Amino acid sequence: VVCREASHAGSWYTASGPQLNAQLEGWLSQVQSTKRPARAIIAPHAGYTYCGSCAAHAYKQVDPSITRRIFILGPSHHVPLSRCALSSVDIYRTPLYDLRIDQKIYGELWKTGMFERMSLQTDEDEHSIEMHLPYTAKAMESHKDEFTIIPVLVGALSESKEQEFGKLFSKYLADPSNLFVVSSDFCHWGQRFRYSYYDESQGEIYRSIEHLDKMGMSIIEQLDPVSFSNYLKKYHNTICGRHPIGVLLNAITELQKNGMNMSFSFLNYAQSSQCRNWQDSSVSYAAGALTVH
Ligand SMILES: [Cu+]
């Protein structure tokens, strides 16, 4: 058709509009805005019942009176993708209100030939982008009729491809009217994820997970894509949105080469549970914001 349905409403977040509106409002109430206006954010894409309050720390930094085009870069979980993919529909539906895809930017991005066209089934099967639509619509409701979205599915990008896509999106990141939402959870720890790296010097397992995550968070705060690449090559932390992050980090360094000065700061860290023994498992969530100066 012409609309991507809220395919994960009911399961990953409440399908009731009034209830969803109230939940996001409540999570956003407990956050004080400190990084307005955010040029980019990093936010988790798990179920709202796990990461809702954490993701609110990122969306409170969005200034709806400034932002007009919202890029959402999410990792692919079901489709083999070596590049980036664009949607084939024109509207993304949410229980709050439906979001419009910026046709001008979609034509510019498609005309590069670096992007693939993802089918409607692939679109609705994926959740890494959709989990940010209700939060985006809520934070932008004061200007609900003046903003568009640019969905981008990010595949298994090579380091060179992360740099190429980063330089491409850098021209859009430099626009003050643009916002880049980078979707990622952090450490998936446990036997279910086949990842059990544990540094006993850090104490308990959940403290080792915390130290491992915040090492990667600090590198992001240093805006260093090469150090982030090495950190992933050294510890193999199960950060599922590492490719969108690497794309953003390269976009920042391309802007730094052109005189622009920026600062990224993480604002909330959380874990779905606190692992203490080898039979435990947890997923970490981190919310951060990028500000341009
Ligand atoms: Cu994930």
Side-chain angles (χ1 to χ4, degrees), residues 2-18 20-28 30-31 33-116 118-120 122-143 145-160 162-166 168-170 172-206 208-256 258-273 275-293:
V2 279
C3 291
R4 179 214 189 263
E5 303 295 333
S7 46
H8 295 82
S11 295
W12 287 68
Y13 53 91
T14 189
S16 154
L20 185 60
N21 186 84
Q23 288 174 358
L24 305 161
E25 187 74 44
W27 285 322
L28 291 159
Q30 294 141 357
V31 180
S33 64
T34 49
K35 305 305 173 160
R36 296 218 183 164
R39 191 69 58 93
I41 63 164
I42 292 178
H45 59 242
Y48 281 173
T49 168
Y50 318 95
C51 69
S53 54
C54 171
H57 278 87
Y59 280 91
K60 192 78 170 223
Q61 318 309 318
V62 182
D63 189 352
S65 88
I66 282 307
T67 298
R68 298 277 178 284
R69 305 163 206 116
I70 304 196
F71 292 71
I72 305 181
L73 276 60
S76 54
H77 289 100
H78 314 290
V79 46
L81 184 58
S82 267
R83 346 213 261 108
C84 291
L86 294 182
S87 178
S88 64
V89 299
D90 297 312
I91 300 280
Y92 272 22
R93 308 204 58 211
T94 85
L96 310 186
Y97 58 91
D98 297 350
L99 314 181
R100 311 162 24 232
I101 288 183
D102 194 284
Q103 309 259 329
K104 190 164 115 42
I105 297 162
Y106 247 45
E108 288 167 355
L109 291 174
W110 182 258
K111 266 152 214 147
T112 69
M114 295 169 66
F115 287 86
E116 283 182 22
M118 88 177 121
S119 62
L120 179 64
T122 294
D123 215 345
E124 272 162 9
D125 202 19
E126 194 52 70
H127 73 266
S128 73
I129 295 166
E130 159 172 9
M131 296 307 311
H132 297 273
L133 310 176
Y135 252 120
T136 290
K138 185 60 211 229
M140 293 297 286
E141 66 178 3
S142 30
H143 298 263
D145 302 311
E146 301 132 78
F147 82 97
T148 51
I149 58 157
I150 300 101
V152 176
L153 188 66
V154 186
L157 292 202
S158 60
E159 315 187 25
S160 178
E162 289 184 5
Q163 293 153 21
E164 287 169 344
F165 276 105
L168 162 54
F169 285 116
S170 55
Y172 298 105
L173 189 69
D175 193 352
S177 285
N178 290 344
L179 164 70
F180 269 73
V181 172
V182 170
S183 181
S184 184
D185 295 345
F186 274 64
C187 179
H188 297 67
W189 199 91
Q191 175 65 236
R192 171 216 316 171
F193 306 113
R194 275 177 289 260
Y195 188 74
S196 288
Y197 171 71
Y198 171 52
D199 172 15
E200 337 172 22
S201 82
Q202 304 296 328
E204 295 237 46
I205 289 152
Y206 66 89
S208 181
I209 300 165
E210 183 190 9
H211 197 259
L212 171 69
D213 277 324
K214 282 177 165 141
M215 277 176 42
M217 275 143 85
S218 285
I219 284 146
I220 292 156
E221 294 182 343
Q222 315 294 302
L223 321 163
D224 195 349
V226 163
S227 277
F228 186 63
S229 188
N230 289 332
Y231 152 85
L232 297 161
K233 277 174 248 172
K234 228 251 225 71
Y235 300 101
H236 300 108
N237 193 3
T238 45
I239 300 165
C240 52
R242 57 162 155 290
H243 297 296
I245 293 169
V247 165
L248 166 76
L249 284 180
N250 276 297
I252 295 170
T253 58
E254 197 70 13
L255 296 192
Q256 289 177 327
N258 300 314
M260 279 163 106
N261 188 241
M262 301 134 99
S263 153
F264 192 97
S265 184
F266 277 102
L267 309 169
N268 192 75
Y269 177 81
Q271 303 178 344
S272 69
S273 88
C275 298
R276 308 233 191 212
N277 35 281
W278 298 102
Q279 278 59 245
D280 291 342
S281 73
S282 51
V283 179
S284 286
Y285 315 116
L290 170 84
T291 325
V292 166
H293 297 133

